[PDB]
Design a protein around this ligand. Sequence first.
Ligand SMILES: [Mn+2]
Ligand SMILES: [Mn+2]
Lengths: 431, 430
Amino acid sequence: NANWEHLLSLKRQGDTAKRLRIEQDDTRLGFEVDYDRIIFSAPFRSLQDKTQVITDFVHTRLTHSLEVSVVGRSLGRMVGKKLLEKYPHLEQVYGYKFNDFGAIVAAAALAHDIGNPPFGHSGEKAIGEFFKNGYGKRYKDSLTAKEYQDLIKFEGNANGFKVLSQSKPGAQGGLRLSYATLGAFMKYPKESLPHKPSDHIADKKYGFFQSERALFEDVAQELGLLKRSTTDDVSWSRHPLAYLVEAADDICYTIIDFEDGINLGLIPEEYALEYMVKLVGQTIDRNKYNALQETSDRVSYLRALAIGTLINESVDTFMKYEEEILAGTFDQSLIDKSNYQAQITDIINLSIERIYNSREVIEKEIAGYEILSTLLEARCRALDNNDTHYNQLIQQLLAPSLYENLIQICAEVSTMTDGKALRNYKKIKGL
Amino acid sequence: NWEHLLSLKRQGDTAKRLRIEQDDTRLGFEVDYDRIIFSAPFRSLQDKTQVITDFVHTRLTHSLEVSVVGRSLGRMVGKKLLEKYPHLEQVYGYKFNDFGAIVAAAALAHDIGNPPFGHSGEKAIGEFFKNGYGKRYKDSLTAKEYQDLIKFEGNANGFKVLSQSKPGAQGGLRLSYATLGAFMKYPKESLPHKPSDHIADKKYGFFQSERALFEDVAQELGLLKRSTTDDVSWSRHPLAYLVEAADDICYTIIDFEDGINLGLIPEEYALEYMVKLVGQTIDRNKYNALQETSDRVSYLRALAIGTLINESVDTFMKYEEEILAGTFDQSLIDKSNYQAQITDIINLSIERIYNSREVIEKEIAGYEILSTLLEARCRALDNNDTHYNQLIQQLLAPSLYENLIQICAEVSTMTDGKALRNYKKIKGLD
Ligand SMILES: [Mn+2]
Ligand SMILES: [Mn+2]
């Protein structure tokens, strides 16, 4: 069974001595510094020019990441305060405070989208398609089964972990986030294989590439995560705070996708109160709602309330199943146990029908397949014959072990802004 | 019999519809015209370009002008047929406006199934299945089903568009069987290919998927058999000759008028090419007082179309018996006394319009656009499990032969814009 004293590790990669919570300066608390390191990092700043499914210029992945980190800070503060009541020795002996849990969830949430390719899950699938059926199929017999699985099922979560921890000359350990933050980041503590060994949400995807396996082994050992398999296919039970990072993300994309689609016209405004009345009625001020004269103001009032309702419930679900999560025996997400799962489901379904299957979004994702394939092919052909005049040009333009080279090409194409990607694609194509 | 050729039957009818008992304000031949006007495929001709993409020479206006010339041919031939066969009016109740409405409606629809980029667009579809990706399906198709694809015809796709059953809408527009017979210039299937040099044998008029329908049409109309084998062929409905003459007249004369207005044809050539066609009716002093090029040439065009309409009526009636017996071998315009001038006009249009660099550039771009969409749809058809091919199905289209012919039908009826837009997205370019 896992221990909250080890799960709240302040260790950073390469540390030679232990970091005790009591001995920290509260003005420079490890977990809070993690948040700043992310805000100021080049991968986070690049989210300015990375659009979500809809490209209205005011629907960015930076805003999503920001709002997920805010909701995440709330979730972790409230759970953190209840956990210190249950296990008083964590504050009495180890010096932990409730804002520590707030900070861990907030930093992991803030970073949760940092490694995703452009164009959504279509972007991930364009990359996988490239190595499964495109030019990149040629590498299959030179890679291990799990190196190849990293590629053909390329996963933005796992690319995220690489962005946060990648060593470079003069920058060992990447952003060097606290291990507790890295533990909460990891929604899927498993390798690419075996694929979907169970129906648990933690088994649905994978969380780290082969290139990062040794790194997460260090994190998992320090946190004391529970070994879920020892069959040479490593996987662990989720760090408890990872459920809150997931819940914050789930809450935001459920409610705020709905809001956005109402504002963009894709969802008639009538559905707003219809799908959300159960989630708001115990807290809504009817007088205030009927005075608001603008649709955007009405639906954002409803969204603030729906999000408040879901945070409060998610805290309760965590505390109820707290011992099962600590044992690694909790099989669902926090949101899967919500009493509003009927309402959440109808919301998600309407959002899919009217937004994610809208003609604009389908078009952006189809063009994304072509943009990502073209960039991957220019990179891989340059890797294969670095001697030609053209491939040396391509090398100066796009990038000035075989598996490490391929995964790095994937990481770099994935972290390109939409601006650099399209401009470089157009250049390659003569447009 | 002309009585049977003038069928008011609609697909699925279980009882004969008699001309004498029709409501004049709701006459089936004229209802056909209205159904076409309001149909979504005819409306889409607004965003379809004939050859020059000036946005003021659409396939819609061409279709309209062909139907106007058709109604005029049908009215005049109609009046003369009722004088030759008076029982048709006095006993069966036909009127001369009936023949104008049948010809007008089939002419209005004649272009409805044609792909973008003209004949280049048909040839790109065919080349996709002869030598491109679509080659793989050859062994899974009958010879006639594959021939539908490698020699894709917009005339046959027009017939499909007009008659396709969909859930809640069996039989397409459900036009009168006379209207569909007047539509079918090539009443044969895709094989055998060009069995003679007869104009009715230069292409084919229906795909295998519409074979059963046209069989029912030909039996009701009483069209004469041209084959006693399993390769079905029939002699053209007489009125199909008038639909063809309306189209022949408009493309020859109005393409020339367009070329002059556009600058592709020097205006100096206007009178030289038209003088035989207009020389006895032209008011030369009024021609010289006209101050705009566009007015001078539209005056010449109206004179020439008038000349060619009157002659075509007279050619039809000189050969009516031969046409009723399926022994007429040519088009009406082939018998014209102005055949040589018509040929000079058409050749000048080929030289100055159809072989201009702008038109050539459009067709080359068309080949890629259609080839790309056809490959995207056909790969999506073969592996509909992958994410990309789910997306391809949602963007373009939300039995193998029935599937392949439907993909050609759908790619063919796309507006110029949506084709270029969807092509641009699949290729990533804006
Ligand atoms: Mn997210
Ligand atoms: Mn025509």
